[PDB]
């Protein structure tokens, strides 16, 4: 859920109050208090960072996008063309929050970055395959709304042809991708824009004002970090008498996977028959790499023997 | 357990055979093959990664540690004394593997490196804290057998003490240490030191003899990777062609985790009285850094009040 710091800070403070009076030295502060003797505004989360989980089951891509370039040598010998396809795709991401948190209900501003998430895949013909994709994600630790994030990959493939004398040749560009589903850890360090230091430094988490409003006092984040009832999400008091937060994310990702280019060879005196059908001996990924045609397609690969 | 590699790859070779031969363009292999016929000993093991899972739940520490400085002025006037104290203490490991491979039943070489971990632990009130601590691991993926690697840590405090005229001040170091129990994945890529490319690269595991022996044929990776029962640890095929296995070690650590120096003051002429206690303001960790005596003592931090 998104847990309201505000909430147990004063939790927290309600709690120390009568037992110690959360370590201020005199006054009284009328326990429990109201949310009026504090000011929580103070408080700073960390820009977070996001785990993802490396997916690890294998799935089932299906065909984004399919085009064609025709070739023709309508000459006399042998000619060497290239084919040469240059795509834009966009991996689309949407991303909202399982476990997050907020400071008195307040609802902060979307942040983007890149994330390195691995990709395992399901080939042509039943092959098992890992890769890795770089894409954006949008994220609001405050809300359980979705927030979507773009990313723009182009498909740049090219390699030469052989075209016999009267034939033409269709090659066929097709673009694998699937709908990938990654949980992601989100992580943040709970610190302040004031310090009650002086004999070491500890966040002031929220100054607490007298119900008359004459005099305050601090409250540290040492209370909180050894507060019996702090949730369980909180990490211990760090070395920097901050608290680690560890919240959830869960992303869909929607992303070309792998581009294959298939070759068809006929005739060009009758184009309704293909003669010959042959791969490009590549597969190329998301990230740019070339895998060999075999692992996502039903073609095994092949060796003659040798004689020693 | 320690998976043998070779028993696999003989497995696969054989569930293959009868089927496409392994991909291998004519020839009698003699299915099922024995052990003969083959030599698993091309294969290689990437150096293994030690991924360290992040222990959360804080433990109870013990004094592993303690000695005394005496500090006497017998003049008339308040001096400035520093105490130093320098003790190397040494970071035990031991570590056994859960989840191994190897080669033909061959025991590897014992490998040792710094891995940062995570230890949270429990101050003396009862206070929760969180720290890293960097050590040196050995690992052995190819046995059960523990293996112990030892690191050295110097504990360096400093720090000047107030000492009044005809006092003895006397200044005790303590060590706080525990033992945890950290289990890490451990990570390898399978390879070869041959390959069959020749329209992309394919680690070959094995070559596979001719009954008679006077011919040969490769088994490449490809063929592994798409066994219907090739265990649960290897990842899919890379794009690299190469395959992941993870395996598991759970290790045993037992280090020092922080320091501290409490002062006691007595009048010199009489020495079997405590006129004053009171501790440096930091207590030090394992890792060099200085955290505030309140995490690790019964003490809570505090503050006087602000009149705005």
Redesign the interface.
Known sequence: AILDLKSLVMNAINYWGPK?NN?????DFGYPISEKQIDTSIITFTHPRLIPYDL?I?QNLETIFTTTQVLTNNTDLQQSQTVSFAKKTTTTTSTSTTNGWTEGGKISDTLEEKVSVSI??IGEGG?????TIEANFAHNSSTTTFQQASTDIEWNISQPVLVPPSKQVVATLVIMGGNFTIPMDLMTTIDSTEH?S???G?PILT?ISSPDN?????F?S??F??WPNLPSGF?????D?TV?YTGSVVSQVSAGVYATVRFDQYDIHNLRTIEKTWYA??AT?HNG????I??VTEM?????????
Chains 1, 2 share one sequence.
Not at 23 to 27: A, K, L, N, S, T
Not at 300 to 308: D, F, G, R, V
Request: aromatic share 14%; glycine share 10%; net charge positive.
């Open positions: 110690n370590g201020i030295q005199g006054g690890t294998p395992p895949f092959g098992k395959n890992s890769t009650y002086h004999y070491s500890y100054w004459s005099y305050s006092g601090p540290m040492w209370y970090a050894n990490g211990p008091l760090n070395s008498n680690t001996r590549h990924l790499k070339k895998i060999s075999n692992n095994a690969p092949t060796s003659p023997i040798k004689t020693n």
